[PDB]
Ligand binder design. Structure first.
Ligand SMILES: O=C(O)c1cc(C(=O)O)c2c(n1)C(=O)C(=O)c1cc(C(=O)O)[nH]c1-2
Ligand SMILES: O=C(O)c1cc(C(=O)O)c2c(n1)C(=O)C(=O)c1cc(C(=O)O)[nH]c1-2
Ligand SMILES: [Mg+2]
Ligand SMILES: [Mg+2]
Lengths: 596, 66, 596, 66
């Protein structure tokens, strides 16, 4: 979308979850910098009126902040000139049964925005847990259309943010833990019409392959593999849902995202590479056809759901050639960098060297060389496998400073024991088939339940870390970087923090009401730079607190890794907004006062 | 099974030691119901049809009716 | 309690809801004052993990903050040296059926603290909605005892804060809207033993009268009136619950509180003065026996439940004589000032002159002269009655500046239509019997649903207001005053505000996450003055929002008066803490950082 | 009825015009069930008995058993 491209250039706006189509989360605003970030204080705040995890972050455009919540997925709009007034709200009516088929808390990763044209005014686009995608008039909040994009009776939900590019709304899928076959769908914003829909497994007619699919890398595999790497019809319930993030290159007119884990978690019930789960896609926008597809984790044994963030950059490779790239920190603990036109593998490095399911990724063959000692299988309990199923990286939307050429990665340091079990598939029921016990990795403090996070600054070409910092808990919510030399992120124990972009030194932090599982965002309004963040702990790490669980293997293995969270945070739900010296519209005390 | 031995491009799976090349008829046979397996696709096809009807009416009337 | 008296002298402590036994809510701390209050911004924050209304405020004693919540009434302790760590928690198990017999949201007005002696350690004391009173070890949070003080099956609940004086825990009662006969009970903190229990209606044997009851004012009434001002056994379900606040004079060894409304709201079903509902009590502490009782509202026709705050002072009367006083802003719109030794009526002035059920209170006869034009009765729709049942003052704990000799009153400007109806009594069911429509009063903006609050500064001897200020919504949560010349309060539309104590000029305000229905509190820690407040809107004014109601007469008449609240706030639940420049323990960024 | 006419100290109630001094037998008779009226006293007495038992045991053992 040409207008989104232009809007994203302005510091007045944050028009999509990733800030820009490249997913940089990079702000050129410098008002807040290394020398004054300690003066950052809350300007104003807003409670969402719901609890459970608050992922994603607000959008800001046209001088309005747009805020989403977890189930029932309410939307609020706020005029930034008077933040205490709710300009409009949208409160969906949903079957509460939708809660029961969400594996990992009733989270939602946020709104999208389409700027309007001469046939339709600007729209806010939201997803609902019960499977719907809804387009709302951005100014008024009134429904423009509502389409069905998932049926909870067969285990489908939606938690991902919709993604707008040109005049399409693209929505992914959730429910691999219930045997849902992944599907990605585009709707025309003007008419609500379905433009295409493509699947992660099955016949090529279902998967949507361009005639030149993987032409530059035929060894990745090409035709027929969506069935031939499965036994009989197991692909029909084969997972590969895409519930994370997208990137988009307007010049190539291609979008990029990863498909998720195969189902069930029990690897013995699905022999074969299980393509095209766990795959990095480069798809043509208008037709949705795949130009390349690289499978990161053939025959997944670990639930390394391949849905994580895509960050686009242009850098010179080791041969001195300028390359258009994507960089992608996977659940499996490898940071993938590919040429985003050809799909060529440029680098594939461990985000932490304790990762042990794979020895290395061979860049020539493109294959991860497995260490059988850390695989999983029926009849065996695998121990001290790194990463955990929760990943060395999960859904957090990270950042890339294009001047420093550094990616700022919010990382989990988590490992696990794992043992599969046999089970039947019944539509609408869970279909996991493994018992899991997750805990802090070797560099942390497993006996004390802490040291399960890291923040690292990474160069995708050299593979080196500019700096590495340990965190008390997994850094779940992503990161945002600015030309002020700052990297912002929130923590599960309830802080927003800023580190020095060059050294990683901790410069500032503030105790929010609840832990953070979304990313910071920033915007400038009437000359003042603001930093805002969701708070309200939840998602996978906090299922123990949120659902009152105690068994260490409960919450798909999360509960035993995060028992100490409840000593540092409780549930919550809201937005906190920060500025230098807490400068605020309400510094004019007459603003909003009765009778003016 | 280290992932490096490939049957064809894009197909490098091997059974682990002690395990069969195919699990049908084995202890690990999932014995999936084809009827159950097809339910997802049925649900999505039904939603596509209902969406299409909404789209046609929207084009006609200019206001969405769910 | 001698130790509580001593602890309350220090600015490091806030040891009871009223700050001190006189209920002054007055701080001598001057770090924050009228000329630097604009520098106040959040220091840190804490989500309670629950929603609905958050009444009361935290306590602070010997370096620890104690925090309570609405149902299910969880307790948190936090060491102020590291506010992000929860030192201990207490989470009661209660029948959720308790929610259904709460008339006016599942609020709780807070903790009490008993400072310990050689027989038992210091204790935190809490009430539960389901009627229990619980004593917890203050250091560890472990249960010391738990007694039954109400049975939800007959309509009893507990929302009031327990009150500690000497070694007694005193607890009130709730449920007049379900025909509960009011009872007040004392328990020994060491043993859990019930020391006395006295009722608001019935034979004198139940009410607990000293032989000298109303000796100085026999025209108030003395013996037998708990039955003789009722017809037959209607007093058995006659209301008079006490769910508000107490004050205590250690020298007189007397405590003071008000009893609530008679049941049902239908006045025609209970002919008679209905004593001793609606009564100001002065009772001996150790025996509980009443030394005086003044009925403010004989034969209530309006639900002016007489439970509001008591504030003690010593001032010269109009004749120049020093008097020991209590001052009490009633729901009925009259501010009562009595001699707290004799019970003598000193002044009884309208807190706003639009009050019209009463022409004036005759100080000689003690009687409110009724205007029959604004009474209620079967077969009649009463119109434009002021105050509303919600009162010109409700449960907010206000403040008194003893140097300025001014009471800072958080006031509601609300009037009503009212029409009773006949209904039967069934134990455990509601027993209201009136349809009510509340709206902003004449000085506000009825047609736009706003102008329903006031803040006024009041001298109890002259009856003069030093200043009067309008507020958009009713000021529900009380006020706190400091020798920095500041009056703090929170508002339903989600602000904490500071006004000039001398002029009422608005000096500062900050947008909290949710509306406020509790009072501000303050304390000094390691040389820094902090102001803290609960947020999380609810209680009677916000039942429309909290329970999704739309009928104007719903929520006992409140819904039609507060429809605009939802445009300014959503639900929430937490504590926000403020200091000059947001100074915080986490200014040391290493505090609480891993490792480890 | 303006509240200023008192048949005794503390008793100034009067029927409003057209209303009876007593409502028993009138159209306003609440006809309360006397056994319903007694239920909250019974409930309070039961709780008092249970608390007292807890208190006696507490004095003996030093640990509260609800
Ligand atoms: O398999 C799926 O389709 C699906 C959905 C989700 C989701 O929809 O939130 C998660 C996962 N998988 C998953 O594997 C996972 O680790 C995860 C973490 C979270 C979270 O937001 O904290 N959601 C999900
Ligand atoms: O009659 C009663 O016993 C009882 C209880 C309460 C309560 O327990 O919260 C209120 C009332 N009455 C009442 O009349 C009232 O206006 C009221 C307001 C509130 C509130 O906290 O917002 N509680 C109560
Ligand atoms: Mg998954
Ligand atoms: Mg009441």
């Amino acid at each position: 979308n040409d207008k989104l491209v232009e809007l994203s250039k302005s510091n007045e706006n944050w028009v999509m979850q990733g800030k820009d189509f490249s997913g940089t989360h990079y702000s050129t605003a410098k008002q807040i910098n290394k020398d004054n970030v300690k003066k950052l204080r809350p300007s104003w705040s807003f409670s969402t009126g719901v609890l459970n995890g608050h992922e994603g972050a607000p959008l800001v455009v046209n001088g309005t902040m747009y805020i989403h919540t977890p189930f029932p997925n309410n939307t609020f709009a706020i005029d930034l000139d008077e933040p205490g007034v709710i300009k409009w709200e949208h409160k969906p009516k949903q079957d509460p049964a939708a809660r029961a088929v969400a594996c990992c808390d009733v989270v939602n990763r946020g709104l999208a925005y389409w700027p309007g044209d001469d046939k339709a005014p600007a729209m806010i686009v939201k997803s609902l847990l019960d499977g719907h995608v809804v387009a709302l008039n951005a100014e008024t909040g009134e429904e423009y259309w509502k389409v069905e994009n998932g049926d909870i009776s067969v285990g489908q939900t939606e938690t991902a943010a919709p993604f707008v590019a040109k005049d399409l709304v693209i929505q992914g899928s959730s429910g691999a833990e219930l045997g849902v076959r992944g599907y990605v769908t585009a709707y025309d914003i003007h008419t609500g019409e379905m433009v295409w829909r493509w699947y992660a497994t099955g016949p090529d007619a279902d998967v949507g392959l361009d005639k030149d699919f993987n032409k530059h890398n035929p060894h990745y595999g090409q035709k027929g593999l969506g069935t031939s790497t499965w036994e009989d019809n197991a692909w029909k319930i084969g997972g590969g849902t895409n519930w994370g993030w997208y990137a988009y290159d307007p010049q190539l007119d291609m979008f990029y995202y990863g498909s998720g884990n195969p189902a069930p978690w029990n690897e013995t019930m699905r022999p074969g590479d299980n393509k095209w789960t766990m795959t990095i896609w480069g798809r043509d926008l208008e037709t949705g056809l795949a130009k390349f597809g690289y499978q990161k984790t053939p025959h997944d044994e670990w639930d390394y759901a391949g849905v994580n963030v895509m960050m686009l950059s242009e850098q010179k490779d080791k041969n001195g050639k300028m390359r258009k790239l994507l960089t992608h920190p996977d659940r499996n603990g490898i940071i993938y960098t590919l040429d985003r036109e050809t799909g060529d593998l440029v680098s594939a490095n461990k985000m932490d060297d304790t990762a042990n399911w794979v020895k290395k990724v061979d860049l020539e063959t493109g294959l991860p060389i497995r260490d059988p000692e850390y695989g999983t299988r029926m009849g065996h309990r695998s121990r001290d496998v790194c990463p955990s199923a929760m990943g060395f990286h999960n859904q957090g939307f990270d950042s890339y400073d294009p001047k420093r050429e550094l990616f700022y990665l919010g990382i989990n340091h988590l490992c696990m024991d794992w043992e599969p079990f046999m089970l039947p598939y019944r539509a609408g029921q869970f279909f996991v088939g493994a018992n899991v016990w997750t805990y802090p990795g070797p560099k942390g403090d497993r006996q004390n339940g802490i040291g399960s996070g890291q923040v690292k600054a990474y160069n995708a070409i050299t593979g080196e870390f500019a700096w590495e910092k340990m965190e008390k808990f997994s850094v779940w919510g992503g990161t945002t970087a600015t030309e002020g030399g700052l990297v912002f992120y929130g923590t599960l124990d309830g802080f927003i923090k800023a580190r020095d972009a060059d050294t990683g030194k901790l410069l500032w932090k503030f105790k929010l009401p609840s832990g953070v599982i979304g990313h910071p965002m920033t915007y400038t309004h009437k000359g003042t730079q603001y930093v805002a963040i969701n708070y309200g702990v939840g998602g996978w790490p906090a299922v123990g607190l949120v659902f009152d669980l105690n068994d260490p293997s409960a919450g798909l293995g999360a509960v035993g890794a995060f028992k100490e969270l409840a000593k540092n945070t409780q549930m919550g739900g809201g937005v906190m907004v920060f500025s230098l010296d807490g400068k605020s519209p309400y510094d004019d005390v007459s603003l909003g006062e009765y009778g003016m | 099974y280290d992932g490096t031995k490939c049957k064809a491009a894009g197909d490098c799976w091997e059974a682990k030691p002690g395990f069969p090349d195919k699990i049908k008829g084995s202890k690990y046979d999932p014995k999936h119901s084809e009827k159950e397996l097809n339910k997802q696709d049925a649900a999505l096809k039904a939603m596509e049809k209902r969406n299409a009807e909404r789209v046609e009416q929207f084009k006609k009337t200019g206001k969405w009716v769910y």
